[PDB]
Design a protein around this ligand. Structure first.
Ligand SMILES: Nc1ncnc2c1ncn2[C@@H]1O[C@H](COP(=O)(O)OP(N)(=O)O)[C@@H](O)[C@H]1O
Ligand SMILES: [Zn+2]
Lengths: 461, 112
């Protein structure tokens, strides 16, 4: 017995090898389980040989059995013909699926979802699964005998089913807090290095700012950098009185790049026309989709809710215009949220990861229904004291004690920042401040000695 | 029209392996034409999306072509047998070697 019938029926293997030989086989009948490695395969070369593409072959071919496969080789001159291989075990689609998983292009997270690696970014979808798009994208990275058969849609559905049924164990995503993900790579914050390609693959970053990183703008000098300092100097004066507030502001600004849990909530306190919304727009333009504006519901309306589920993996949540909770007809901050919005996992798939710096802007000092010592530890406030008013009412603002300086309003800044003019210079400033403060540790300190409501407790003390 | 309008089908007794033979009665040609066809048959098998188009046995196209006769066992120790099928109750409709060129029948051959 020269054949081991542990792989495939000998008749089926002979049928396969005959199908490979387009030319008619002369002695097909005498091939049995005890001679197929011995008798040469004489072939009537009516058509060109299916292996060497020549008119004919001087000598007959021969078969060998090795490694669970059939090796087809020509006698006489070996280099005159191409060696051929017939496999016997495995559905070819299963081999393709094994190769595709083998690349680590498709993974599953703890959410029972499947993330893929298309166009240098970890794509993900739930309504329309996109494993098959990955298969199209990756067919170029496989031999020809796989690319030729990855085209038919039903074969791709079969390969997708195989991949689904082989990806058992879950991987953890977004473990690097000091990496800023774009759509074309990841920027490292500890260094100034940018990784674009397979280098960004190792950091399983499933979110992105939404715009491509450009090395021609992220230099330092910039056409826009100088007036960006002018604007930041005007909004926050570089003075000895407004000194501590300056680095507090810079720390709050930089804490929006780190992808970890933040231990404080910052209040932008200032009067009208102080530039708080200017900073809001600058951050939005600088970090793309990582910045999100929410409503007042997550402060005054019960959490468990799209406004609490969309903050999943967002690195900055900004709250706008608390409507004078000090006066009547208002709902207080209800500090239970302050208990809730800082602890690492947000309930509201009801579990989401919290990487967001929460910044709330206000014109009036806000009040809580209950004041506790845990509120002492997680609240900081930023004071804004520069006025950008129209030429008409400058004096009426220069005689107000709520402002330390009044500046002439420029009507063109909103359109320019909306055009992402200061998009990269401001990001450069953010990185510079991050290296200045958040290396090697990121943590935020509260300022209990600023909110007037906390004075009474200090009066108790 | 000759091959579509008149044909017969055989059914095998093996259910796990669907084995079938279709014989078009009103079409006749020489065997070298079949051998030359084998090429285009292989390309059609590789290109068509129909699952049955994969499972055509082109290796049967060989000198002294042999096929199991209807009503006869494949092997003495095997019980897979090709049986009669309606509406064709004539065994002559299941023999490709039988030649009956009528007015509806068409014959063709290679120029060379
Ligand atoms: N440094 C500056 N130079 C000129 N105009 C400036 C400025 N800083 C801010 N502004 C403008 O003055 C206004 C103050 O900014 P805004 O963010 O709206 O203030 P606010 N209402 O939130 O206190 C805006 O219209 C802004 O475009
Ligand atoms: Zn050859």
């Amino acid at each position: 017995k020269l054949w081991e019938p542990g792989f495939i029926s000998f008749e089926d293997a002979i049928k396969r090898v005959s199908k490979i030989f387009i030319n008619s086989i002369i002695n097909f009948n005498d091939l049995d389980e005890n001679n197929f490695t011995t008798v040469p395969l004489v072939i009537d070369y009516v058509t060109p040989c299916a292996l060497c593409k020549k008119r004919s072959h001087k000598h007959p071919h021969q078969l060998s059995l090795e490694n669970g496969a059939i090796r087809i080789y020509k006698t006489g001159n070996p280099h005159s013909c191409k060696v051929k291989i017939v496999p016997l075990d495995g559905n070819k689609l299963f081999n393709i699926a094994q190769r595709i998983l083998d690349t680590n292009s498709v993974l599953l997270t703890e959410r029972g979802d499947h993330i893929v690696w298309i166009n240098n970014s970890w794509k993900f979808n739930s309504e329309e699964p996109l494993i098959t798009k990955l298969i199209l994208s990756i067919r170029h990275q496989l031999p020809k005998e796989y690319s030729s058969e990855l085209l038919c849609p039903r074969k791709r559905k079969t390969v997708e089913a195989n991949i689904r049924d082989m990806l058992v164990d879950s991987v953890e995503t977004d473990t690097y807090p000091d990496k800023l993900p774009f759509k074309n790579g990841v920027l490292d914050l500890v260094d100034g290095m940018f990784y674009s390609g397979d280098d960004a693959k190792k950091y399983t970053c499933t979110v992105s700012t939404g715009f491509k990183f450009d090395d021609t703008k992220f230099v330092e000098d910039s056409p826009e950098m100088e007036e960006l300092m002018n604007i930041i100097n005007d909004i926050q004066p570089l003075t000895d009185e407004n000194k501590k507030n300056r680095e507090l502001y810079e720390k709050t600004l930089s804490s929006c790049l780190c992808g970890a849990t933040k231990g404080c909530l910052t209040f932008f306190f200032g009067e009208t026309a102080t530039g708080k919304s200017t900073t809001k727009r600058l951050l939005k333009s600088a970090i793309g989709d990582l910045f999100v504006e929410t409503g007042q519901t997550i402060l005054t309306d019960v959490l468990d809710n799209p406004f609490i589920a969309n903050m999943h993996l967002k690195r900055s949540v900004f709250c706008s215009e608390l409507p004078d909770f000090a006066c009547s007809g208002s709902k207080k901050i209800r500090s239970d949220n302050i208990k809730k919005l800082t602890e690492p996992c947000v309930i509201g798939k009801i579990n989401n990861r919290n990487h967001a710096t929460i910044i709330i802007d206000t014109n009036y000092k806000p009040v809580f229904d209950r004041i506790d010592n845990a509120l002492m530890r997680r609240i900081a406030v930023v004071r804004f004291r520069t006025h950008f008013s129209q030429p008409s009412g400058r004096e009426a603002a220069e005689n107000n004690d709520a402002y330390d300086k009044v500046k002439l309003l420029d009507e063109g800044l909103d359109g320019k920042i909306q055009n992402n003019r200061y998009r990269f210079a401001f990001l450069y400033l953010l990185v510079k401040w991050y290296k200045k403060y958040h290396i090697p540790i990121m943590k935020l300190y509260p300022t209990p000695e600023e909110i007037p409501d906390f004075a009474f407790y200090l009066k108790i003390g | 029209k000759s091959m579509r309008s008149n044909f017969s089908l055989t059914k095998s007794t093996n259910r796990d392996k669907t084995s079938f033979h279709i014989i078009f009665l009103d079409t006749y040609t020489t065997m070298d034409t079949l051998i030359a066809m084998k090429r285009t048959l292989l390309e059609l098998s590789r290109s068509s999306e129909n699952p049955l188009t994969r499972s055509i046995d082109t290796a049967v196209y060989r000198r002294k072509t042999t096929l199991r006769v209807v009503g006869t066992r494949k092997n003495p120790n095997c019980d897979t047998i090709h049986v009669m099928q309606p509406p064709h109750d004539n065994i002559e409709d299941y023999l490709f070697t039988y030649v009956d060129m009528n007015n509806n029948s068409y014959y063709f051959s290679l120029q060379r």
